[PDB]
């Protein structure tokens, strides 16, 4: 529980230090979620998954992907932006659109399922700008305190003595751009992959190949994007 336990317990060691400036804020978000339940409102993902993106090592991140907020439909969000459990079908529409761009860009077959944990295990941070949502109500937790947390995460990544490539999908993700100003960081921005915006420039954006080009141009290893 993020109200009750500290970052050293909740997240990976490097992330716990990176998020020190927002330690009180994370506890406050735990208190917000408690109050939602007390009032009879729900949230997604499950409490134990809210900080999941920060359970993969901070020092290993080479690319971050940033979306808006978790999937609104119960049974979809798992704490890793855009990912679903390997037994979910049909895929969420945003994810189907991501995978159509993945095939168009990379030439790979469609993935077997919607589980993006291989990316997380290969140095991709799968972050949402806001880390909870009320069911059925996209953006319902915008402005409730998560933005300071995810801002802190990006600044800390950007401060490391390492290259970083950010892929910012949609308007709320784009508000992290200022924090990526330093010369070791590069940002790719496009419209969000949901059907409401994907046809404004997400399709054809080739983010995966571009990210790898950028990493190689900074002396870093490219991501193996191939999903099984």
Q: What is the DSSP letter of 3?
A: T
Q: Which stretch binds Na ion (CB under 5 A): 54-62, 69-77, 86-94, 178-186?
A: 69-77
Single out the segment in contact with Na ion by CB under 5 A; choices: 8-16, 76-84, 132-140, 194-202.
Answer: 76-84
> Token digits for 206?
């080739």
**In the complex with Na ion, which residue's Cβ is closer, 52 or 185?**
52
Q: Which is nearer to Na ion, 78 or 214 (CB)?
A: 78
CB of residue 133 to Na ion, shortest distance in Å: 9
Q: Would you give the binding string for Na ion spanning residues 79-118, x where CB under 5 A is met?
A: --x-------------------------------------
Q: Nearest CA to 217 among 180, 186, 175?
A: 186
Q: Which is nearer to Na ion, 71 or 225 (CB)?
A: 71
Edge-to-edge strands, sheet with 185-190: 124-128, 63-67, 164-169, 185-190
* Residue choice 10, 29, 77, 157 for contact with Na ion (CB under 5 A): 77
Q: Which residues are catalytic?
A: 69
Q: Which of 70, 92, 114, 163 binds Na ion (CB under 5 A)?
A: 70
Q: What is the DSSP string of 138-199?
A: TTTTTTSSHHHHHHHHHHHHHHSSS-EEEEEESHHHHTTGGGG-STTEEEEEE--SSTTTGG
Question: What is the rounded end-to-end Cα distance, in angstroms, of the chain?
Answer: 33
Catalog residues that contact Na ion under the rule CB under 5 A. Answer: 70-71, 77, 81
């Amino acid at each position: 529980s993020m109200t009750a336990r500290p970052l050293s317990e909740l997240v990976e060691r490097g992330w716990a230090a990176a998020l020190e400036p927002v330690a009180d804020q994370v506890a406050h978000m735990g208190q917000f979620l408690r109050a939602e339940i007390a009032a009879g409102r729900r949230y997604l993902p499950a409490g134990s998954n809210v900080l999941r993106a920060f359970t993969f090592p901070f020092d290993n991140v080479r690319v971050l992907i940033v979306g808006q907020d978790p999937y609104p439909t119960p049974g979809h969000a798992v704490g890793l932006s855009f990912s679903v459990a390997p037994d979910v079908r049909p895929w969420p529409r945003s994810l189907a659109n991501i995978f159509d761009e993945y095939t168009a860009d990379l030439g790979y077959p469609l993935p077997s399922n919607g589980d993006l944990t291989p990316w997380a295990q290969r140095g991709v941070l799968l972050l949402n700008r806001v880390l909870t949502v009320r069911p059925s109500n996209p953006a319902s937790h915008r402005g409730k305190g998560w933005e300071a947390v995810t801002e802190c995460a990006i600044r800390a990544l950007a401060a490391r003595a390492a290259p970083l490539v950010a892929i910012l999908w949609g308007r709320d993700a784009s508000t992290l751009k200022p924090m990526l100003a330093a010369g070791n960081c590069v940002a790719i921005e496009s419209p969000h992959p949901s059907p409401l915006s994907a046809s404004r420039g997400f399709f054809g954006s080739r983010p995966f190949s571009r990210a790898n080009e950028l990493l190689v141009g900074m002396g870093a290893e490219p991501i193996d994007w191939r999903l099984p």
